Design a protein around this ligand. Structure first.
Ligand SMILES: C=CC1=C(C)/C(=C/c2[nH]c(Cc3[nH]c(/C=C4\NC(=O)C(C)=C4C=C)c(C)c3CCC(=O)O)c(CCC(=O)O)c2C)NC1=O
Length: 139
């Protein structure tokens, strides 16, 4: 099932990402800089219940990091927005993968789904809804 997100990826199109970043208390520096980025994912997994992901973002932020999670298990995360006390948790929702961030008494969400070959992640904080679209490294 999750063998559909697995692979190599690359930014293609984004919209309303900086303002999202603001909704989640990021300084302008990081809202702009973060939107400015063209991140290159490297996604894979083991036993359809433990997904290992990577991110080579790039200029201007230079924050290359990694995810390593079990699906159904809450874990700790330290994003680039500099959030103290992020508690993630990722689920499988039909053909979609739902990544949820808890912090300071709030919840933001990432509904990722493959479509027309692209890894399309919709991002939801309050009334603010962002969208980005990735393509495989011409796989
Ligand atoms: C389902 C597989 C999958 C997973 C698990 C995934 C996770 C994922 N996607 C991103 C990129 C990444 N980077 C940022 C934001 C930034 N980028 C910058 O250089 C800066 C400074 C900021 C902050 C202002 C966000 C919001 C995301 C996640 C959204 C996305 O690109 O999908 C990160 C690191 C972001 C950070 O530094 O906080 C992670 C863990 N992406 C996928 O496709």
């Amino acid at each position: 099932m999750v063998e559909k997100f697995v692979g190599t990826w690359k930014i293609a199109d984004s919209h309303n990402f900086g303002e999202y970043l603001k909704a989640i208390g990021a300084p302008k520096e990081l809202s702009d800089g973060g939107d400015a980025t063209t991140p290159t994912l490297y996604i894979s997994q083991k036993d359809g219940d433990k997904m290992t992901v990577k991110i080579e973002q790039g200029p201007p932020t230079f924050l290359d990091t990694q995810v390593k999670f079990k699906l159904g298990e809450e874990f700790d995360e330290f994003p680039s927005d500099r959030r103290k006390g992020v508690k993630s948790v990722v689920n499988l929702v039909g053909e979609k993968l739902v990544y949820v961030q808890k912090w300071d008494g709030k919840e933001t969400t990432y509904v990722r789904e493959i479509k027309d070959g692209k890894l399309v992640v919709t991002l939801t904080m309050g009334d603010v809804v962002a969208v980005r679209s990735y393509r495989r490294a011409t796989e």
